[model samples]
Target: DLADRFAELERRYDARLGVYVPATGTTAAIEYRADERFAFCSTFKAPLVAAVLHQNPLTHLDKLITYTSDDIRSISPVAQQHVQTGMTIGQLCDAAIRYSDGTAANLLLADLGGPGGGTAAFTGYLRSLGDTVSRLDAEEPELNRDPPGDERDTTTPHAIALVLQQLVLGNALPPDKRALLTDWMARNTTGAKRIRAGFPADWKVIDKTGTGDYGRANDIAVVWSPTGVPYVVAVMSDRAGGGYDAEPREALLAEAATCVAGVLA
Candidate 1:
């Protein structure tokens, strides 16, 4: 049933899609070419949040961190608009999650140990948490753009889903840190048309969105239904559109989410 259900949807879209629904009890419930690599874009920040919270205790979140213009980049609205000079780890991380701010992503990465150290810490954190297919190779400037470098961050749907699962259900972070991560994502307003489009009016869905140079649209989330079932879903696409009709790509993501919600409903 899954093979047929996913095949029917995959044929309609030009890009690869990865779907994971824990309600089905399989590790990765639905995957359509999910292993194929693509620029992970800002969705990479989600795991970075986990790694940061893991290494830095909850008290560390309050430590004031300074980020200059060097940490601020053009692609991020969070850092450029929210904090110009000094912000606590909590402030920057909140902006990063809710806004998909490249500036906050980089600043958080830098604080993690500098971008190189941040990338290493993120990758190591994922590996330690049972992820094997995602890797962070470059900073936000190199990864988020109209024509990002080929050496940018990359991840498999399965790999990222595992990270999300770990955040929600695993022993990676303390309970309070986990609550913090979910709270930010639940209030996220960055890309609302993707996975959030499929939910009922009052349902709770926590998500992170990612975009790249070649029209890569990515969304990962921990979705909750009124009935108490919570599932993880990730949809990523690299289509031919330049940037004009980004909504359609996001609509595909919404449709993918609707498909799964229907199955569970």
Candidate 2:
């Protein structure tokens, strides 16, 4: 029934949709193309920030880093506003996750290593967390280049969901760092129309969203029901023959989230 519902959503939206909702105490997992590769886009920022917190001491996050015009990326909303003022590593993490700020993301990547080694370092961090299906090969806008058939900068829904689970619901980071990361995700300003739109107002959700070339739109989240049970949900989608300017299929993703909520209802 879930597969059929997802198929209907895909056909109606003219997009390929991938979903992975891990099992909860009362419901079995629901998956559709869970292992299929999709461009990771900005969704990786969540894990990227998580890895930064994981490898560094809590005190390290307070160190401020200044930037110039050269450091800005095409899609930096929060960073651009604070260009005159430097931002701390902790603030960058907040910017990257809560605002999906690319400039902030690249700066944090440099902390991990840099373009050459940072991508590899972040990938290694994911490997350490037991994620083998996700890869990061570039920084910022380049990483968002979700070219068809390109494996670089891509992740399977299942892999990302697992990563989210480990970071938010598991023991990947220390309690303080985990709290900060979860706070950023919970306060994210970019996902109101996607997965967060599907659930009732009372359900608490912490999520990260991504948008990129080929009409790709994705959201990975940890959602809590009123009963105190939590579910990890990842929804990734891209339309055939669609480009960067194409309208994002947010409703489809919302419908998918609605379906998952229904399963537990």
Candidate 3:
């Protein structure tokens, strides 16, 4: 019933969805232009997380990761640098994901080695999954741009959805690694009624939210149902700010993704 509603809404919203593959790795082939590029927002962090877990020694999980102003390039200073907090690898794992903590995420990006490796981690995972056009990292202008001016990396909707599929399946990260990943996602930075909004009150949706005023904003989730059917849902959009409208964009994105979750999960 929900999947049918999703099909209807996708058409209604003028949104495009490409082949949606399930956790079983099964897929639904549909014709669409999934190649149009948009800033993927913070959804980019999930792959970075998966990469960090697989490459680093599990011992790093206990390391005391520090947050400093130099990290402004990777994460938002507003959330992390202000507090000058010291977190464990586990807390880094939590803050980076749950809070979409820029400092934590930037640190994780560094640990995965760098944005190059972070890119490699994302695209490599896609290739490993059999999806193409969904790509890895590349050059991005410093995010501190004043007018925004296309400052971040670009990606496709289809490729992003493919990522959701992997994350929902739990194979994206090993057990010990997933334990930390899932824990933080459950705590999400978007908070109540934002990108995490509009789901059944009892359900648990592990997600991350990212917004770049002159770039793009996004919300991604791996919806796990009580009956055990799991599904991945994502929403991405871009804007050039300066008197930009405040239409609860993240909430809209969350509602759209959640609607898809209603059907697919």
Candidate 4:
């Protein structure tokens, strides 16, 4: 009956899903158009946090980075809320991951040695893990934009699932830093309507979300079931485009994730 719910979700949402449970070594994945590449956008922030903390010392995370007119840019909760103020490296990361803050991501990029450094750091880490779709170029606004001539970062549902699995399994970073990363995502507010909808109170959903040009909706997370199974689910609506609001469709992302939760329940 639970499996039937997942099957019904597939017929309704036109989405791809990757579901894995580390507790029992069980896995279920459904791909409609998952082989194709889609703009990764802010979901890339998850690995960015991993790479930054993995490659740096705890002291480095505390180093303060100041803001300027240049740091102030479009589409960031940070810039909008905390205008022209300075925050430490760790705080910037929290903003980037928890709030999906572009200003925070760009500042993190600068601290990581600018756009090129940040790109190399995460993409290289991902490559070592066997994922190759994320191409970090430009930063923030450009990173989200997919205009005719721009080359935005990209990812696949498979790739996203792999990273979440690694992070959850303690293969990606040390326990403390891995906890730091997941803790930030656990508090994520941006995708509130995307994948956490209708989730049972006891379930813990830790994820990062991305919205890209042409209305793409992307979410990657480790969903821990109330019954004690840890399921990693990556749901992508690459072409959801302007029509996807927090509703029957966006909630469907959570429903898709719930499909996996049902498997463990």
Candidate 5:
């Protein structure tokens, strides 16, 4: 049964949802429902990876891919996977994105080439996706740079959904690219109760979580349920005493995600 079925939990959460697959011939997965635009935190980096793959020759991954502590520092999580040198582009990308390797992500960002290299180079790509609302300028947290603007970015579920749209439309990459992306994304290690509490332990849930200061949190996902075709779901919110707030409660994931779990239907 669903948890977070209490009044206190509802008070703590701010939510909005909408699902769309422009390429699937499925007008809107659900409806263009009411949702909010928030920091998007680290999740924005997901599509940014596309820029790396597009710009950097995956062939580069074949070489030693040398780097100093600073070069590989941020991507430490995935860096842990690189103890052995000389990895293939597919392998590096698999480890980096699949596991949300901070080191791998940073490396790829660096590989994006020079100033405005990473996400900066992809601004045009983001706009071309047909979403007029998103604004990610110059790429923030240049963990590699000082002018790193943390809040220097903005987005909505609709825009993110559109990034997935590019994957489907062949602008971002081929169908194989989407498959590789989803498979890699499914390997991310950040899953938490918010996105984890709803499923019955057997559902193959592919999701990504984003968290930050002032109680910011988000979960965007694609679920391939047992009884129905797959569907994508994204839930995000902000405003509260961090996790100490009143309504978000302790077990809201079960309740809110119950609605999300129905995506497969």
Candidate 6:
């Protein structure tokens, strides 16, 4: 029934939709094209910041990392504002997750070791968490290039959903670090109209979103019902065109979330 509903949603949006919602005690699991690869876009920032916190235990998040204009990327709102003031590692994580700041992500990647090593380091962290299908091959803007048939910087819905579950709901990170990650996700400013929009106003939702070329739009979230059961939801989509949309199909994603809510309800 869920599959049929998602199929209809895809037809209506004229976009390929991939979804994966792991089972909760009270709900059945839903998977549609869950194994198919999709561009990760900014959705990867959640894991990127998680890896940063996991690998740098000795480093306090309060430690500031200074950057110059040369280090700033085109779309880094938070970082650009603090170019001279510098931002803490924690702030960078916040910027990346809460604001989808590309410069913040690039700086954090540099903190993880830069292009060659940062990509490997982050992917290795994913592997440690039992995710083998997600990979990051480049930095921000470049990584958003969601060319069809290319696997670079891509993730399967199932893989990312599992990673989110493990990191946020499992023991992948210590309690403190997990709290930090979930706090940022819960407070994310950019995804208000995506998956979160589909849930009832009182339901608790934490999420990360991604947007890129080829109409690639994605949201990965953990939602809790009023009864307290938590479900992990990943919805990824892409249109057939080559250029980017002025904005991702937020309404479509919200509609997809509404479908998930129907099943979970």
Question: Against the true structure, what is every candidate's RMSD?
Answer: 3.1, 1.3, 4.9, 3.8, 5.4, 1.6
Tens-place lDDT per residue, model 5, 1-265, is 2123322444645432222322244524442322345556556556666665565554654645655555554445656655555445565566555555656655565566555655565555577667566655443343212111233555676677666546533457755556667776777676657566666566766666655444555666665557644555555544444332323221444555665555434
Candidate 3's C-alpha runs over 4 A off are: 1-34, 73-85, 114-152, 239-248, 261-265
lDDT of each: 0.74, 0.89, 0.57, 0.69, 0.53, 0.88
Q: Which regions of candidate 2 deviate over 4 angstroms?
A: 114-117, 243-245
RMSD over all Cα atoms, model 4: 3.8
TM-score per candidate, chains pooled: 0.87, 0.96, 0.71, 0.82, 0.71, 0.95
Number of colliding residue pairs in each model: 0, 0, 2, 0, 8, 0
Q: Give me the displacement of residue 18 in model 3, in angstroms.
A: 9.5
Report the candidate with higher TM-score, 2 versus 5: 2
Candidate 3 similarity to native, TM-score: 0.71
**lDDT of residue 260 for candidate 3:** 54
lDDT by residue for model 6 (1-265), tens: 8788888988887788999998776666789999999999999999999999998873669899999998775478799899779999989999999999999998888888854748888888899998988999988788987576789999999999999999899999999999999999999998988999999987899999998878788999999888878999999988755355534577779999998887787
Which candidate achieves the best lDDT against the true structure?
Answer: 2
Alpha-carbon runs more than 4 Å astray in model 1: 1-13, 23-28, 82-85, 114-117, 145-152, 240-248
Against the true structure, candidate 3 has what lDDT?
Answer: 0.57
In model 1, the clashing pairs are none
| Distance from true location, Cα of 80 in model 1, Å | 1.3
